[PDB]
Amino acid sequence: MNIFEMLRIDEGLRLKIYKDTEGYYTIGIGHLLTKSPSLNAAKSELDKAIGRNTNGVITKDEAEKLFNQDVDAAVRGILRNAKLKPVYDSLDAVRRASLINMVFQMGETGVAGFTNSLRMLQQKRWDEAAVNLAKSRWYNQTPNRAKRVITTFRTGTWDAYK
Ligand SMILES: [Cl-]
Ligand SMILES: [Cl-]
């Protein structure tokens, strides 16, 4: 199991524009297109991301390409972030995947906002971090996915994904 397979389970794969859990236009494996209500604004963003006139549909290869870019970007954003980087550097391989998953989902800014949980993870206080991570809108809005990520942080294994 790895970050790609992990995010593929959490995000699914859809080849046609769809609305995410927050009602935003998305495509492929969790690739956010726009927060605008406009479907035309989303098709425009899509064509721009793909480099062709897609009329709202993409192929599996195209979805996987956006996916590879988004994972790369999540990692690079963590490494560039003064608050995230030290956490990431401190974690083992499995838990690092957990942090990438959160950044992919809610953005670098959003994760960097989990001040107390980050401090707990850096200190390796797994049980405490798990409790603090759950007191969040994130957990309350997408509980099943949040629990899988939190269990991964707590145990350092991929059990929640098997
Ligand atoms: Cl893009
Ligand atoms: Cl969920």
From Swiss-Prot:
Keywords: Antimicrobial, Bacteriolytic enzyme, Cytolysis, Glycosidase, Host cell lysis by virus, Host cytoplasm, Hydrolase, Viral release from host cell
Effect after changing residue 117 to I: 500-fold decrease in enzymatic activity
One Pfam family of this chain: Phage_lysozyme
Effect of residue 11 to A/F/H/M/N: Complete loss of enzymatic activity
GO biological process annotation, one example: viral release from host cell by cytolysis
Swiss-Prot/TrEMBL induction comment: Expressed late in the viral replication.
EC number(s) recorded for this UniProt protein: 3.2.1.17
Family: Belongs to the glycosyl hydrolase 24 family.
Protein name, as recorded: Endolysin
Record gene name: E
